[PDB]
Amino acid sequence: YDIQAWKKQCEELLNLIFQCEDSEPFRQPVDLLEYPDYRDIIDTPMDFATVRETLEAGNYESPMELCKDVRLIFSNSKAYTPSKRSRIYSMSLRLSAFFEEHISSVLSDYKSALRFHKR
Numbered sequence: 001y002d003i004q005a006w007k008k009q010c011e012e013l014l015n016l017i018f019q020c021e022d023s024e025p026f027r028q029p030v031d032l033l034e035y036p037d038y039r040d041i042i043d044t045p046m047d048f049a050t051v052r053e054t055l056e057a058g059n060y061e062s063p064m065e066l067c068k069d070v071r072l073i074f075s076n077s078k079a080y081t082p083s084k085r086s087r088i089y090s091m092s093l094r095l096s097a098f099f100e101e102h103i104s105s106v107l108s109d110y111k112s113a114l115r116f117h118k119r
């Protein structure tokens with residue numbers, strides 16, 4: 001029932017994500033010199049360094065907000081990919097599966113703790 005436990009749990013999951021080779025295309029903002037039309041397709045860029053910095057600044061109130069930004073990294077990759085078989089998009093799908101598998105208990109524990117707080 002610890003309402004604050006999600007933050008360190010998210011920090012540890014982000015550390016695992018940064019160790020994953022599949023996260024390399026998503027660690028830093030997409031470079032416009034490499035992908036000149038990126039901002040014609042993607043309105044809201046997101047990357048794992050931005051998520052980590054937002055968490056560390058104390059700018060997430062809940063793990064749901066962090067989850068929304070991580071999911072935006074994956075939806076941006078899906079929207080930008082020229083093919084559903086592209087290398088970077090394929091890496092995004094594996095990384096998304098790994099993230100969803102691990103974030104599930106973080107979200108459940110937070111929501112349960114909050115329900116207990118408001119009982």
Ligand SMILES: Cc1nc2ccccc2n1CCC(N)=O
Nearest residue numbers: 025026030031077080081088089
């Ligand atoms: C984030 C992303 N998703 C893509 C899907 C397909 C092709 C490129 C893609 N990028 C950019 C890779 C980078 N510039 O770091």
